[PDB]
Amino acid sequence: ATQSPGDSRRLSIQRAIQSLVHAAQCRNANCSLPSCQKMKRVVQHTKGCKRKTNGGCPICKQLIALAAYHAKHCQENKCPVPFCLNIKQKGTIEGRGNEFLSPEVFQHIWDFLEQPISSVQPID
Ligand SMILES: [Zn+2]
Ligand SMILES: [Zn+2]
Ligand SMILES: [Zn+2]
């Protein structure tokens, strides 16, 4: 067509989700992963994101895309991702939430996770 659907986006997204999902459910002494320990820092961002009540930070605003992308395939009793857990309890539209897209900035979050040299200074 003029534009193709986001099917291959899965190969790009699932790579970022392997770390996110695992780190969300990483609450155990037996849990020992490399990417996990790094991901924990990103989890602290939403943990203290008071800005959500004012709008939301770039990380938070961006992560929602992935929460919903995982929710179509994560439909369980106690979903690992804390954001998708809310999607399940609100799965009443099954359209608006699911249908989400973000620009190349989506990749920038995973870059600073390892190289904190930007402070994601929000702008207009
Ligand atoms: Zn872990
Ligand atoms: Zn935030
Ligand atoms: Zn889930």
Swiss-Prot record:
Residues with PTM Phosphoserine: S4
PTM description: Acetylated on Lys at up to 17 positions by intermolecular autocatalysis.
Q: Where are the zinc fingers (TAZ-type)?
A: 6-87
Instruction: List where in the cell it is found.
Output: Cytoplasm; Nucleus; Chromosome
Q: How does it assemble?
A: Interacts with HIF1A; the interaction is stimulated in response to hypoxia and inhibited by CITED2. Probably part of a complex with HIF1A and CREBBP. Interacts (via N-terminus) with TFAP2A (via N-terminus); the interaction requires CITED2. Interacts (via CH1 domain) with CITED2 (via C-terminus). Interacts with CITED1 (unphosphorylated form preferentially and via C-terminus). Interacts with ESR1; the interaction is estrogen-dependent and enhanced by CITED1. Interacts with HIPK2.
Query: What does the entry note on its domains?
Result: The CRD1 domain (cell cycle regulatory domain 1) mediates transcriptional repression of a subset of p300 responsive genes; it can be de-repressed by CDKN1A/p21WAF1 at least at some promoters. It contains sumoylation and acetylation sites and the same lysine residues may be targeted for the respective modifications. It is proposed that deacetylation by SIRT1 allows sumoylation leading to suppressed activity.
Report the protein's function: Functions as a histone acetyltransferase and regulates transcription via chromatin remodeling. Acetylates all four core histones in nucleosomes. Histone acetylation gives an epigenetic tag for transcriptional activation. Mediates acetylation of histone H3 at 'Lys-122' (H3K122ac), a modification that localizes at the surface of the histone octamer and stimulates transcription, possibly by promoting nucleosome instability. Mediates acetylation of histone H3 at 'Lys-18' and 'Lys-27' (H3K18ac and H3K27ac, respectively).
Q: Which disease is it linked to?
A: Defects in EP300 may play a role in epithelial cancer. Chromosomal aberrations involving EP300 may be a cause of acute myeloid leukemias. Translocation t(8;22)(p11;q13) with KAT6A.
Annotated protein name in UniProt: Histone acetyltransferase p300
Source organism of this protein record: Homo sapiens
Which start and end residues of the full protein are shown? 1723 to 1812 of 2414
